[model samples]
Target: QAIKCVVVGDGAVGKTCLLISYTTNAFPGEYIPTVFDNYSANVMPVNLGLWDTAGQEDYDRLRPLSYPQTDVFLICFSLVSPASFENVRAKWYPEVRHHCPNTPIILVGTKLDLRDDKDTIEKLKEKKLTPITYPQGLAMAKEIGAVKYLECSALTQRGLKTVFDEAIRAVL
Candidate 1:
């Protein structure tokens, strides 16, 4: 059986990057909105079907169409964007639960490499904000009853494989 996993988050928060990096082993050069792209991978004995969804408000009505038969969800947020992180609780969680209440969710913090970048830090400092820490992500996962919390950097390929590996585990 194939495990269906949906990835969702606010626009430009690296949801696409996470999937592209995982399935293709290469990071995307430019960021773009995803409508209803599907990718497949053989993760050991499991065949994983990954559904990439658009996070933009414009696609709100169309995005949920992919939720049916989903085994798990990867709710992603960029580490450097506090607003994106905030939306996990404010938006994504409630939305997913409304459709797939019983499906396991994995809270993913994307862009791990930028969390420590000087320029990224400086830009956030200008707004009196900072990147989301790992503990914060774990706390959110617990609060939302997520099965797990993981962080990865698509650019660096750090912890990239583990994200999908764990997703497979969640379903098995």
Candidate 2:
């Protein structure tokens, strides 16, 4: 059976980047104007049908486009941007659970390069801010029974293969 994967995230957190990397192994640094929600199928031993749902508040209205056949879901965020992380729990998780409750969820922290330098849990603590970051992402992934909580950098090609490989394993 073909596996359907839905990629969800706020605008420009590298959801599209992750999808491109996962599917075509291509990374586009700049956004292009288009409406290609469903990208090309990457034929591995396990086939992937990926949907890149738009971000922003209007994305909720497009929820119907991602359900029913979703075998796996990827809730992506940029660890370097705390707001993107905030959206994972407040927006992505709740919505995906509501739409596709039984789907195997995967949480991905994009832009690992920036994260290593600026978004470390220790840095957040040093700044006296609550650290709901890497650890919290891991916890949330665990709580949701995700296959794994992964960190990826689409730009530098770090951790991207790990995320896709884990997703394939989860599907198999």
Candidate 3:
């Protein structure tokens, strides 16, 4: 309750682990859970809850409903799941950008642990779906620069602090 903010990426795309691993600042867990448990932190003068908003249909209406209360947002996509990456441009990008025009948003990619996973790569190309990347990261950087800064996350625990710090920096 200190400085509550929300993350509204499609639920199944490791958005669970986005908030989960970051708050724990540890290794991957056995089973990922829902956003209801909301992760809380103690790193700041005014700590925050990393709120996980439901993805897919339930969040279509409800996600924005929670917008006004948050200090910031995170939109996620998985490297292996183009289906997850697909939404950022057409679905989520516009929705959040337009609705909460002034809200601070962070766009992050998931599945870094899986990026080099052959199983994921195999299935990805078999379906003609690529992992979507670049030395400087996605082509999305320039275009989406119209709003939120670009970022990334994984359970490897290297990126969790910057995220909360960035968000906390933007807020209290």
- The digit string of per-residue lDDT tens for model 2 on 1-172 reads 5787888888878887777766666677676435747764555666677788788776678665667778788888887767888788788888888888887888998988765464465676676754345787798778767778999888888888888667766787
TM-score of each: 0.96, 0.83, 0.83
Question: What digit string (tens of lDDT, one per residue) describes model 3 on residues 1-172?
Answer: 3887777767577777767677776555786664255788877467787777778776487667777767777777776687777787777778877788777767676766677778888888888977867433356634555234444556676565676677777775
How many angstroms is residue 82 displaced in model 3 relative to the true structure, after the best TM-score fit? 1.8
- Candidate 1 is scored at a TM of 0.96
Give candidate 3's whole-model lDDT: 0.69
Q: Which should have the higher TM-score, number 2 or number 3?
A: 3
Choose the strongest candidate by lDDT. 1
Tens digit per residue, CA lDDT, model 1, 55-94: 9999899999999999999999999999999999999999
RMSD of each: 1.4, 3.2, 2.6
Cα displacement (Å) at residue 127, model 3: 0.8
lDDT of 1: 0.91
Query: What TM-score does model 2 achieve against the real structure?
Result: 0.83
On TM-score, the candidate that comes out on top is 1
